[PDB]
Amino acid sequence: TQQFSILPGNKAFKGKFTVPGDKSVSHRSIMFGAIAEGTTHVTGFLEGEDALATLQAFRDMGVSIEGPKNGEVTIHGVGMHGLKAPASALYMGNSGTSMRLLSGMLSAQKFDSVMTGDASLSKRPMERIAKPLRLMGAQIQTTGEKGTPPVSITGGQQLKGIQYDLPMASAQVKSGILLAGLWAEGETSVTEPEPTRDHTERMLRAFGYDVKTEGNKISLVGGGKLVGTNIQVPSDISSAAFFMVGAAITEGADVVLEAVGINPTRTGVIEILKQMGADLTVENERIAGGEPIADIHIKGSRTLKGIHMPEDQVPLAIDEFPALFIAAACAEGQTVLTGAAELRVKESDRIQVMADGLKIMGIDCTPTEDGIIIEGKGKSGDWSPIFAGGEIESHHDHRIAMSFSMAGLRTSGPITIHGTETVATSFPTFTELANRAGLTIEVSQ
Numbered sequence: 001t002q003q004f005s006i007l008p009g010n011k012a013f014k015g016k017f018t019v020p021g022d023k024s025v026s027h028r029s030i031m032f033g034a035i036a037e038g039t040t041h042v043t044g045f046l047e048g049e050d051a052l053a054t055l056q057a058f059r060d061m062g063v064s065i066e067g068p069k070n071g072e073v074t075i076h077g078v079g080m081h082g083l084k085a086p087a088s089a090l091y092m093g094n095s096g097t098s099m100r101l102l103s104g105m106l107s108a109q110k111f112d113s114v115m116t117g118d119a120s121l122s123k124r125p126m127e128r129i130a131k132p133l134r135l136m137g138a139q140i141q142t143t144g145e146k147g148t149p150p151v152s153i154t155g156g157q158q159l160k161g162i163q164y165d166l167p168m169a170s171a172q173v174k175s176g177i178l179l180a181g182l183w184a185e186g187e188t189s190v191t192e193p194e195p196t197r198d199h200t201e202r203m204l205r206a207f208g209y210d211v212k213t214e215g216n217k218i219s220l221v222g223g224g225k226l227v228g229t230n231i232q233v234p235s236d237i238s239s240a241a242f243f244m245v246g247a248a249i250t251e252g253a254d255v256v257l258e259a260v261g262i263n264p265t266r267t268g269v270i271e272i273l274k275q276m277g278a279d280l281t282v283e284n285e286r287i288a289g290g291e292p293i294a295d296i297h298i299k300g301s302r303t304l305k306g307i308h309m310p311e312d313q314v315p316l317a318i319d320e321f322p323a324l325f326i327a328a329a330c331a332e333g334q335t336v337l338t339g340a341a342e343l344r345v346k347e348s349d350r351i352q353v354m355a356d357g358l359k360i361m362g363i364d365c366t367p368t369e370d371g372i373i374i375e376g377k378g379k380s381g382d383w384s385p386i387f388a389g390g391e392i393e394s395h396h397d398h399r400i401a402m403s404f405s406m407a408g409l410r411t412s413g414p415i416t417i418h419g420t421e422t423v424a425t426s427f428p429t430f431t432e433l434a435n436r437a438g439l440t441i442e443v444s445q
């Protein structure tokens with residue numbers, strides 16, 4: 001166990017900062033850089049659980065890779081057919097993402113493969129991706145009735161593109177199918193019943209592959225070719241969100257977050273904060289590595305106010321609601337969240353864990369079946385403490401820990417957050433940026 005400690009008192013919160021690279025986009029650059037023609041140089045790379053497992057997999061399959069080192073990776077791509085058979089099982093650790101995306105890719109290879117995982121991944125079913133791949137002609141075996149790992153794939157198959165109506169929305173399953181479709185005969189198409197992130201699609205385009213996005217119908221034609229290029233990874237908006245919130249709840253705060261990724265499938269926190277009356281502007285908009293980026297300028301010039309959060313932004317801000325709950329508490333009036341049933345018990349009930357911590361800090365809130373109700377203690381023009389402090393349980397959820405860390409900007413008492421050791425893995429520079437901004441956080445045993 002590890003814990004964060006924060007002391008009460010009027011904090012400053014200002015500066016120009018760049019948060020770490022987007023987790024998902026970092027991963028995709030490896031997926032496609034490995035099988036592209038020529039060299040790929042990646043910058044702003046953040047290696048997470050997914051990246052490291054995928055990095056090792058392609059190393060095992062003969063790909064030469066320098067790094068990651070200081071956010072830089074050089075990938076000597078081997079072309080669409082340059083992968084070599086792994087000498088043993090490809091260990092995925094806890095990366096279900098790696099396993100699902102590589103399933104599609106591996107099911108199209110000449111050679112056999114086995115994918116295995118740790119105790120947690122070994123329990124996760126893989127039939128939602130395996131089933132459509134089998135329709136394409138893939139030979140993919142799973143374990144037991146629930147179809148969990150190990151996932152055993154037989155190569156040397158001829159895949160055919162299918163038109164697939166996805167029963168349950170999933171960027172991972174969607175991505176797995178499309179990746180197999182790169183080697184398949186004809187067009188592979190996925191129709192998702194609900195909108196998901198499109199980092200896979202955008203990275204494919206960055207590498208020169210044509211991908212049609214036509215409403216909820218996402219498709220490509222197999223036989224194409226990927227071309228190595230330079231990939232600047234956008235900084236993670238999910239990481240930036242904590243400092244957006246911090247700036248919006250701190251008096252006279254002035255924060256510029258540079259090169260923040262603003263993929264429209266990820267920008268829900270911006271729209272929501274804006275609707276809460278936040279002084280938040282999006283300037284210097286441009287594109288890097290097929291991803292849109294911008295500088296986010298947030299000022300604590302006025303008091304947030306509680307709103308009925310827009311339901312059309314919930315899919316776009318799903319991971320940012322723990323941070324937004326902190327904003328809601330400092331806001332004037334009541335905040336209500338609906339249509340966020342996904343947010344409850346998604347193998348971790350963030351609504352309740354936040355509620356527990358918020359209540360400990362003296363905030364009247366109430367979990368609902370599809371969200372939460374928060375009674376904000378904010379008052380227009382008033383920047384007196386909102387939170388009472390206390391001891392907080394994060395349950396090793398980094399987003400919970402980082403959220404309650406921001407609460408230290410408006411607390412009348414000490415805050416101790418337990419189980420914060422996963423914060424550094426997700427957001428390595430979090431406490432550093434916090435300190436540079438004016439939010440001192442002491443890490444302990």
Ligand SMILES: [Cl-]
Pocket residue numbers: 024171172175197198199200201
């Ligand atoms: Cl994605």
Ligand SMILES: [Cl-]
Pocket residue numbers: 319399
């Ligand atoms: Cl998460």
